Amino acid sequence: AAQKSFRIKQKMAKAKKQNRPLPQWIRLRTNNTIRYNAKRRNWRRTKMN
Template sequence: MSTAPLVLCAVGLCTMMIAHVMAAHKTFIIKRKLAKKAKQNRPLPQWARMKTGSKIRYNAKRRHWRRTKLKL
């Protein structure tokens, strides 16, 4: 994996970020980790809400693909 500097400008504010580029040919270990993270990134089942009496309403560990990057 290589890193390339990326400049993002929004509302007159420019910040420098490091963007990680995912390779097209992935190793099996990386692919397995990505598959696990994809399975974990789902909403809470409705039966779990009913079981807890709506004390747990959403998955707190939900991850957006663009906002929060994986540290692989």
């Protein structure tokens, strides 16, 4: 809201850091069931809080 509380800024900041696709060297490893990042969120698609 331009005048954020720090408690909201800290959580926006974690949501920013979390917003990336799967690093494409983990698909190489042994048994690796993981294909793509399932918990990926866009600012358009779904909101938070």
